[PDB]
Design a protein around this ligand. Structure first.
Ligand code: HEM
Length: 394
């Protein structure tokens, strides 16, 4: 009856205490997870990469281990990617990737600058103190996605409100469901409206993409839009909030940043590694027997890629436990690895670069409004973060 995965953090910016010792002894081991099911726990950097690169592992798992019951909820179909296996994941990712290009993401920089400035304009008009989460972390990323999707500015308010409601988690089952149906309704109308009046947005591009093959219908488009939005919003928001929190709690690194603004890119990469916000890790099931770190994984067995522990493997980086923005960026696993690796990562990087540069330049002497020990952390969420971040500035 294998030991329960360490979850408790005596320091909120750092991993659960017990994890380092498991990683040093047994980087592939057995554990009991939050559902009460026992699975393979993979904590070593090399092992977690080998696991994520191995296309023997399916993403269509028998148990949701991070959850109270082992119950894998309702899954989306073609175009949603997250729960697809090859060959259909892959060809559908390929279709998506044809239009959701890194070129298209780079082309969104002016948009992101504008959105970031608009939100800061609003923050500075009010003073002082504000909740950065509500007013900035949760708002910017969904607005970036609405530009990606061609949403005109008159339509932003509704999109923002619907995206936000979808995201929040002081909510019972029905409220949660209601928020999802309100979103799906919005995206269905958005799809129709792009079919009527195409534009230069991602959805209009997907509508006319080359589709041999017959697969891009309204359903496929709704699944892709919803997954892009969902995957892009809470993750980026968590990074903005936690990354700001960790920087404000790290006046040493922040000083290095103010002394040398060219460190923003490296800061963003060190923040990604340091926070690895997918705190519980990628869930896979073997579809054949596989050998991983000398240990044999049977067909049908479930495995949890603990990307957070891997991002602190001392074989990955030296003194993994210092938060050091001067590091030359290493290949962290915050965006995953292999076939399911974050498709929007170049966009997330651009957003975070613009956010952190603009935030610290525009609000100099930004400062926590309460102590760090009073902040409330996202203990049980798929994405780790803070619920609120009260701050003031000059
Ligand atoms: C800000 C930080 C973000 C993090 C830390 C993150 C993390 C991830 C991870 C860890 C995966 C792999 C999941 C797994 O292997 O189980 C993934 C996939 C995905 N991400 Fe991100 N993401 C972030 C931002 C974004 C943005 C801006 C977008 C999209 C516009 C995005 C869109 C997606 C999509 C559709 C997938 C699934 C890809 C597939 O399954 O083939 N993410 N993300």
């Amino acid at each position: 009856d294998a030991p329960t995965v360490p979850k408790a953090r005596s320091c909120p910016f750092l991993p659960p205490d017990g994890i380092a010792d498991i990683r040093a002894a047994a980087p592939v081991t057995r554990a009991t997870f939050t559902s009460g099911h026992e699975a393979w726990l993979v904590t070593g950097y090399e092992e977690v990469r080998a696991l994520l690169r191995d296309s023997s592992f399916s993403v269509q798992v028998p148990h949701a281990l991070a959850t109270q019951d082992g119950v894998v909820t309702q899954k989306p179909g073609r175009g949603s990617l997250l729960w697809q296996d090859e060959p259909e994941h892959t060809s559908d990712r390929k279709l998506l990737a044809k239009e959701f290009t890194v070129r298209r993401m780079q082309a969104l920089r002016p948009n992101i600058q504008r959105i970031v400035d608009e939100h800061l304009d609003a923050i500075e008009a009010r003073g002082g103190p504000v909740d950065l989460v509500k007013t900035f972390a949760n708002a910017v990323p969904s607005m970036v996605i609405s530009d990606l999707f061609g949403v005109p500015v008159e339509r932003r308010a509704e999109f923002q409100d619907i995206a936000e409601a979808m995201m929040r988690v002081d909510q019972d089952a029905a409220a949660t469901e209601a928020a999802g149906m309100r979103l799906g309704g919005l995206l269905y109308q958005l799809v129709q409206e792009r079919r009527a009046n195409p534009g230069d947005d991602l959805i209009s591009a997907l509508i006319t993409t080359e589709d041999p093959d017959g697969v891009v219908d309204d359903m496929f488009l709704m699944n892709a839009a919803g997954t892009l939005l969902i995957a892009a919003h809470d993750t980026t928001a968590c990074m903005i909030g936690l990354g700001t929190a960790l920087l404000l709690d790290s006046p040493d690194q922040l000083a290095l940043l103010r002394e040398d603004p060219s460190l923003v890119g490296n800061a963003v990469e060190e923040l990604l590694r340091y926070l690895t916000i997918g705190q519980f890790g990628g869930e896979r099931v073997a579809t054949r027997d596989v050998e991983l770190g000398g240990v044999r994984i049977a067909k049908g067995e479930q495995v949890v890629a603990h990307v957070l522990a891997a991002d602190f493997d001392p074989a990955f980086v030296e003194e993994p436990e210092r938060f050091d923005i001067t590091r030359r960026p290493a290949p962290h696993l915050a965006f995953g690895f292999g076939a399911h690796q974050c498709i929007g990562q170049q966009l997330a990087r651009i957003e975070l670069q613009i956010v952190f540069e603009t935030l610290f330049r525009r609000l100099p002497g930004l400062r926590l409004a309460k102590p760090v020990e009073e902040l409330r952390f996202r203990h049980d969420m798929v994405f780790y973060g803070v619920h609120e971040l009260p701050v003031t500035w000059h």
